[PDB]
Amino acid sequence: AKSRSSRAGLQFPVGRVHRLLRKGNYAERVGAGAPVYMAAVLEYLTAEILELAGNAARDNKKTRIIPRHLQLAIRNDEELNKLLGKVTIAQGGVLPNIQAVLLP
Amino acid sequence: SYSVYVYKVLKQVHPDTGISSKAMGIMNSFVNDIFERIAGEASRLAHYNKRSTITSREIQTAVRLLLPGELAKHAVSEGTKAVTKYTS
């Protein structure tokens, strides 16, 4: 009756993650806390990148998040940059960086 | 698509900041990519140990294998905090 996602305290769908694990050909059986754990990990990572992207949008005086803000947030944080290190973000641009010998 | 839940999480973390339609496709790609990363390493761990069940233990170990440094420490702390609340 508690939707099983609010029963764990998450805003991510435990049922959908369970369905995806059971249909993704990962193992023959899927446990009970496996979808809860995976949805908790996805929700926290989402909330962290989204925490940094909103901060970047605030620094640029904007009240919206655009691919530029997500790119800025990811590449300005060492651990999310390490995680998303082989990832191309569309319409993201680059981190502003020009070397010292080039600067006069 | 995870658009509804990403927007629910964004309203929790930034109540007065909106999101674009191109920045939500990016977050959907991110969620669908990280889900495949963890669930393909939990799958690998189960086969290495000759197990047929993907439990929260394989998810925790896969998170520790894939997430860097302090990301893993907090992702694990949130994963065991949700399994605790879910089974109690």
């Binding site: 909330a47 962290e48 925490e51 940094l52 | 929790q12 973390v13 907090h74």
Partner: peptide, 9 residues
């Protein structure tokens, strides 16, 4: 009480 991290705060 907006959601925040402890890895960042």
């Amino acid at each position: 009480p907006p959601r925040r991290s402890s890895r960042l705060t």
